[PDB]
Design a protein around this ligand. Structure first.
Ligand code: HDD
Ligand code: HDD
Ligand code: HDD
Ligand SMILES: [Ca+2]
Ligand SMILES: [Ca+2]
Ligand SMILES: [Ca+2]
Ligand SMILES: [Ca+2]
Ligand SMILES: [Ca+2]
Ligand SMILES: [Ca+2]
Ligand SMILES: [Ca+2]
Lengths: 319, 673, 672
């Protein structure tokens, strides 16, 4: 794994510069014991330059979040419905990394804000990396990507004073929702307990969009991804979520970290609804429209495989 | 003030950044249900902009808020400094200030326990001058090279990035206990100074000794102290925690609102001035940033008034982008050989390259000076200037020798204090004059009132009880014990360890003025303080009582919120959104007594607001004459200090306003025996 | 205009930091007069940090180039064919900035490399900036933008050793050309004198792609942009270009700078060929194919307006280095076509400015700003120079009263896609069969050159291909050249010791087209700015008099005259030591200097004579005014473009006709 090869062990040894020269890093070099610090102190400048440059821009959305490593195991040879190599054999294992998140808050905002949550999953397959960048709610606020900055500006803090943090509870957000009626479906989801899940482990993941599964013979079917929690669905109540935001801003990332350390890594059945191309408009709405679900009564779930998260990261920044 | 750079979008058709009129609501597609086209430049320019909106947060003090204002000098200070902004009675200079916490990221809560930033830029007529200070006058460490150690230890553990905006974890207390220089700042941070009621109710300190330098070359040693005209005030910890959840924006909102209401905050900008010969005369080394000069040894001199009175137009462009530097220095000021200050000078010029992404960060509007620039700096990413001079080297004849060198004797140049010298070996050694890490933490502790000392003990009990390593907890007790055996015993009691035997080497009974918050007396003004009036829509008389109270309270500049079950004319907030952390005092109108179950708010909400306000020390009361139903339900004694009951609205308000100035009724908090 | 506002004057005043604090910058602050430098020296660190960060990435292609400001003036109200506002009125003037460039070389490489040249023009219109990002050659090497990194990697230096600089004369390039036959047309242009123009002012500009003109009624027509030089077409000869690359790497930028300063700013007629949408495939090729020209016989040029460059920049870095062109800079009245090369360019030029500028606010640099108000909800980003007053930057809103308003075909003079455009069919990664003829038009181009011009093209190929090490690559090259012309393949093969493959006549023909020949385009319409070197001596008062009388006679006609002698003095501009024939368009020896042509510590052995002999070998008009000189030089007196007159005035009348003729091609040997 590319990760093991890049691990650096510092449990023994003498301090070195980044080019392997043994040094110290506790006292600046000075002209006399009560003197001014010297420009020639390369130990000081290399250490402080690194520190000065430690930060990178946070993600433009989903800046607040936490990740874990695990495995995906296929239940079957799915060649009959897709050419995807990671799905081509019973028992086939593929390493995964998942990051969960809120959407609107900046990187130090509270886990238990009311919001849509991200659920992004990378499958490091033997025919390349495959990402499903999903949310815990199966429908999105807007019908065209060109509108994304409008939605996001409206829910993020007002830009004169940057208030309020990680909240749709302000004029601009409700102005946008009320002027752009496509938002109603996701708004209803976000105003339900799905806006304040009990943990990352007690929510589902959805690809949201219709995608295609394509067979080697070139034929295709339309699919929706649904990752179904084996832990069950659970929410906070709002008054509790507000107190929690203050008492433990890290509640979800801690809950996940602890579940993994205790040998209780969370699991989801990775599923799809699969329909024919001819059914794009058969269900009373258009399958190209990301504000619509296919009700399970019209298309049942097929279970493709098991996703399990069971290893925490070594360095949060790096991973 | 930055009017020249403002862009108005109150009219007009949408354009690209190159002024072509466009639309930005629907992608261009091959057919009505088709794929989006690569030739859609409207789409790509808008999304590329959005994709690149974010810049790195500051490495420290990432969470903060700013405002514009004015500094006015009280005198001609020519006799102690050549500084131009200080050279005439009433001389005005524009300022911009940013306040902040230190450890938390962007979006973390204002009301975390932390050291707070107080960074002030003076846009002077001889260049920008920044004083990049904190609300605590001493720093954790004695050498700038240790800054990444301190900051790594207090920021979240780097495997899981937990916990946010908190020193309550093993690594922070490991560092504090292994690096005893940290004791003084630690005691300040564990006091009420770690949880100020607002940015307007805290002071600002330069921390380091600097120099004032006269035009004749003579110098004096100085400390900067910005003294709040609003008074000093803190939260209680249990209130700070709830506020962190109910309103992460509490400090920035408080500042924004104070400015909008014509109540812009003020400070007297002051210095302690001492001679060069007094650098080691006070029983410690003035080069040591872990030490204060007790005011009994050097009084404060008031130089001028700092008032903040205008909010930014765009937070990102102004507050997020402002790039402070202690190297932004002007003639009349100089540095000292404080090894913490010395290294800062390097860091703040370097770190703006990370934030800005390129070298021309001094060109952003908020960073520009208000005088002309004449230099041979050229090119670089994002170069906004078009330089005429095609011979940007010195010495030249082809541009007639311009720009001219500025120095002590020509052009009002900056100059290093000419009496400064260095001697001795080139060493990476700490001066033994820095070795007493404990006497001043004890001085501070001794200077707090008894309940203030209890609050500080309780903060330590809270944080240290969360440290998992029993070796770290013991090492912590070792250090606290060197400051005070009593502190160590009392903290130990909460963590079920025994304190080590008294070690009296640094114990003493001296005290100093001006560091206590509890002891600083009633607030000098109650304007902007918040009063929540709890009422009901059930009784039209409760609303009438609330309206009467509003009129009488607003007349004195208090911010009044009437709370009821539902909104209507006269009601500002519903019970569902109301919380005691939203108010500095709470009044119930006696017509609403019955509320003290509904689908409109959580069970017990009206009573909980009142009980919380009481337990956190706020003035509370019932107006109207019938008070026992409410006071009994809340288990509040009618005869309590800071508890009011009057039928007369006028009399109620008179008494209640005395309580808002007292601010906290400390007699409601238990003390260790 | 945004430009004047950002000018900074440093002709007076004391040195200050970037925050206005007066300082010095000549000596570091030290602990003692022989001591170490102090970290607290903020004067030193701000100065050196700026220096350390002066450089930005060079452009990925066209890194070497030079720009100027000017004006475009419309000749008419063109509303009959386009809604474009800058074209809506007779005499309507629009400010422009133009950058010219080579393509392959890095930013310090020589102007006179053999290459395709860029000609990028920005019109700062009253309806937004409009850029036409063109070249001096009307066709491009490849038919799909996705292939651009392949082309460019192949022509740029080999990536193990980064050799050779600014040259297609290496195996990788010819490997690519020989494997990707679409390259043949542009290859023939680049191997002609078009690859080595005499100056930026003596070449044309082409948009290359078919674009659309769109009327306010929504109807559209197809167009090609052609900027036609009012200075005439002229080239260097290859040997000359090689010498110039060493003697004066700045030759073209110097020439442009100097022409502008002297009040001789270059001019072009901005022209279009216009044809109907129904003619997309009517000319025997597909107008979506960027490797094809429309012959002027099929579609004449319509003159739209005048482009003039007449003001040099103030700061090269801030203006020329930082200008960031995009074909995505389009205005109402113009639209794109489905040319797969143009389609992908639209993506690249918006993306690549992030690399150059290091942040997303590159349109805020003064050179990139428009001249009209900007109204949009783009916010933040590194280097944000605006303070936005609209605190509700989202659409739809009520909190900012629904502003800004959406602009489109009906409202607010919005850009709109030509509404007649459609797409139909499978989603495919397939090349249209209509693109498959890669050889007929290169042959048309070749046929259209004069015999000596054909020889120069054969000789450029002989030069470059002889430097290809791989015998298999050389064979593969002959295979492709042979499909254009058997004779070309035969003549190239003779220089490399290979046999040409047998004639394959599938694409051979004898058709010609007008307007592509340099040699055939006739004498230059103006000789203003052309350079005359007068080779004189300080050893004879008579020689300096002769030179001075000639100077005044030539200078009045706008010629740039350099008098050369052994050492400088009044009347002498340059020494023999620094002079070279590549410095002049014509060379005259004053006969009083006869002795210098027969050793000196002041110049290299044989220098005066070698300047005259080089100038003659390179085709330039050469003269002796007063021969022993022509004998020493082996220059026949009766030769065309060789002048011998004792009279000054008769010499100058004759010589100036020679400058207009420009090159005397009878001096170059032809095959057979
Ligand atoms: C056109 C813009 C746009 C639109 C319409 C969307 N997003 Fe997105 N999304 C971004 C532009 C973006 C982005 C700016 O590109 C981010 C920021 C960080 C990153 O890697 O991509 C991102 C991040 C991002 C992340 C964080 C991944 C991580 O943990 O690092 C998730 C989970 C989502 N998005 C999920 C969605 C879902 C489920 C969408 C609707 C179906 C969606 N996004 C629409
Ligand atoms: C050598 C490293 C170093 C050391 C010892 C310090 N700092 Fe610092 N400080 C920085 C390195 C730094 C920095 C990394 O350079 C920051 C981050 C963002 C910036 O502009 O500078 C910064 C930011 C920063 C800010 C935020 C300014 C703003 O609002 O934008 C304040 C108020 C302070 N610091 C105050 C202090 C005080 C009172 C110190 C002790 C007397 C101190 N710093 C020591
Ligand atoms: C898909 C990639 C791609 C393709 C197919 C082309 N180019 Fe390009 N071109 C770029 C990608 C690019 C670029 C990497 O985006 C550059 C580098 C610097 C810049 O601003 O854009 C560029 C620079 C650039 C410049 C320099 C502009 C200036 O002076 O700053 C000119 C004149 C051209 N190109 C002209 C053309 C012509 C006439 C083409 C074919 C008709 C062409 N390019 C195809
Ligand atoms: Ca708002
Ligand atoms: Ca629920
Ligand atoms: Ca820890
Ligand atoms: Ca307190
Ligand atoms: Ca000095
Ligand atoms: Ca090669
Ligand atoms: Ca030629």
């Amino acid at each position: 794994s590319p990760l093991a090869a890049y691990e650096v062990d510092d449990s023994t040894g003498y301090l070195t510069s980044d080019v392997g020269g043994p040094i110290q890093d506790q006292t600046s070099l000075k002209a006399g014991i009560r003197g001014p610090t010297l420009l020639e102190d390369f130990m000081f400048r290399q250490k402080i330059q690194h520190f000065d440059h430690e930060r990178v821009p946070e993600r433009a959305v989903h800046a607040r979040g936490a990740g874990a490593h695990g495995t995906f195991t296929s239940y079957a040879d799915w060649s009959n419905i897709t050419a995807a190599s990671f799905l081509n054999a019973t028992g086939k294992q593929t390493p995964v990394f998942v990051r969960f998140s809120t959407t609107a808050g900046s990187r130090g905002s509270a886990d238990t804000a009311r919001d849509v949550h991200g659920f992004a999953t990378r499958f490091y397959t033997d025919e390349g990396n495959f990402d499903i960048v999903g949310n815990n709610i199966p429908v999105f606020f807007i019908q065209d990507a060109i509108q994304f900055p409008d939605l996001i500006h409206s829910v993020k803090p007002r830009p004169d004073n940057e208030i309020p943090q990680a909240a749709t509870a302000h004029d601009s957000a409700w102005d946008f929702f009320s002027q752009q009626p496509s938002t109603m479906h996701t708004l209803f989801w976000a105003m339900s307990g799905h806006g304040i899940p009990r943990s990352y482990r007690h929510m589902d993941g959805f690809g949201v969009h219709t995608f295609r599964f394509v067979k080697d013979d070139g034929s295709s079917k339309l699919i929706k991804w649904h990752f179904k929690s084996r832990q069950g669905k659970a929410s906070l109540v709002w008054e509790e979520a507000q107190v929690l935001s203050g008492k433990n801003a890290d509640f979800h990332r801690q809950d996940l970290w602890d579940a993994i350390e205790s040998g209780n890594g969370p699991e989801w059945d990775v599923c799809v609804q699969i329909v024919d191309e001819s059914q794009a408009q058969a269900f009373g709405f258009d399958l190209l429209d990301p504000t619509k679900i296919i009700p399970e009564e019209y298309a049942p779930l097929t279970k493709l495989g098991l996703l399990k998260l069971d290893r925490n990261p070594t360095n949060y920044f790096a991973e | 003030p930055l009017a020249a750079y403002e862009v108005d979008d109150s009219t007009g058709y949408l354009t690209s950044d190159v002024g072509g009129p466009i639309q930005d609501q629907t992608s261009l597609k091959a057919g009505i249900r088709g794929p989006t086209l690569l030739e859609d430049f409207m789409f790509r320019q808008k999304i590329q902009h959005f994709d690149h909106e974010r810049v790195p947060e500051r490495a420290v003090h990432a969470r903060g808020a700013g405002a514009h204002g004015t500094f006015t000098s009280y005198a001609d200070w020519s006799n102690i400094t050549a500084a131009s902004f200080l050279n005439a009675t009433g001389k005005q200079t524009p300022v911009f200030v940013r306040f902040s916490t230190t450890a938390g990221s962007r979006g973390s809560a204002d009301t975390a326990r932390d050291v707070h930033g107080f960074a002030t830029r003076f846009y002077t007529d001889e260049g920008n001058f920044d004083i990049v200070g904190n609300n605590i006058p001493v720093f954790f460490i004695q050498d700038a090279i240790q800054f990444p150690d301190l900051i790594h230890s207090v920021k979240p553990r780097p495997d899981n990035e937990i916990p946010q905006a908190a020193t309550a974890h093993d690594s922070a207390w490991d560092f504090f206990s292994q690096q005893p220089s940290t004791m003084h700042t630690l005691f300040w941070a564990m006091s009420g100074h770690g949880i100020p009621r607002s940015y307007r109710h805290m002071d600002g300190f330069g921390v380091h000794t600097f120099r004032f330098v006269k035009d004749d070359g003579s110098s004096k040693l100085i400390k900067w102290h910005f003294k709040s005209r609003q008074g000093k005030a803190s939260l209680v910890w249990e209130e700070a925690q709830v506020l962190s959840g109910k309103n992460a924006d509490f400090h920035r909102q408080d500042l924004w609102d104070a400015i909008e209401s014509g109540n812009g905050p003020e400070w007297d900008v002051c210095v302690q001035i001492v001679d060069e010969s007094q650098a080691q005369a006070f029983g410690f080394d003035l080069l040591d940033p872990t030490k204060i000069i007790p005011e009994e040894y050097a009084p404060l001199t008031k130089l001028g008034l700092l008032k903040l009175d205008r909010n930014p137009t765009n937070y990102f462009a102004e507050t997020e982008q402002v790039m402070f530097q202690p190297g932004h220095i002007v003639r009349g000021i100089d540095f000292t050989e404080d090894p913490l200050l010395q290294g800062r000078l390097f860091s703040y010029l370097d770190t703006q390259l990370n934030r800005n992404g390129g070298p021309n960060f001094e060109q952003l509007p908020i960073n520009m000076p208000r005088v002309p620039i004449h230099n041979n700096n050229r090119d670089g990413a994002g170069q906004m200037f078009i330089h005429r001079n095609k011979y940007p080297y010195t010495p030249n004849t082809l541009n007639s020798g311009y720009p001219r060198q500025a120095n002590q004797n020509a052009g009002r140049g900056f100059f290093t204090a000419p009496g400064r010298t260095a001697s001795g070996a080139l060493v990476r050694e700490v001066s033994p004059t820095f070795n007493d890490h404990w006497s001043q933490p004890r001085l501070f502790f001794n200077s707090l009132t008894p309940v203030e000392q209890q609050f500080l003990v309780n903060a330590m009990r809270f944080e240290i009880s969360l440290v998992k390593s029993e070796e770290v907890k013991k090492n912590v007790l070792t250090q606290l014990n060197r400051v005070s055996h009593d502190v160590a015993v009392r903290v130990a009691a909460a963590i079920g360890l025994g304190a080590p035997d008294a070690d009296d080497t640094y114990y003493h009974n001296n005290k100093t003025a001006g560091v206590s918050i509890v002891g600083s007396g009633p607030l000098p003004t109650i304007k902007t303080l918040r009063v929540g009036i709890l009422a009901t829509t059930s009784e039209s008389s409760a609303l009438d009582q609330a309206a009467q109270l509003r009129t009488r309270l607003e007349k004195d500049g208090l911010v009044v919120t009437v709370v009821a079950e539902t909104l209507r004319e006269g009601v500002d907030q519903t019970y569902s959104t109301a919380d005691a952390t939203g108010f500095d005092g709470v009044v119930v109108v006696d017509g609403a007594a019955a509320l003290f179950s509904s689908p409109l708010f959580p069970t017990g909400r009206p009573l909980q607001i009142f009980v919380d306000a009481y337990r956190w020390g706020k003035p509370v009361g019932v107006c109207g004459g019938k008070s026992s139903e409410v006071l009994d339900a809340a288990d509040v004694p009618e005869d309590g200090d800071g508890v009011y009951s009057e039928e007369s609205v006028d009399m109620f308000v008179e008494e209640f306003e005395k309580g808002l100035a007292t601010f906290r009724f400390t007699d409601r908090f238990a003390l260790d025996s």
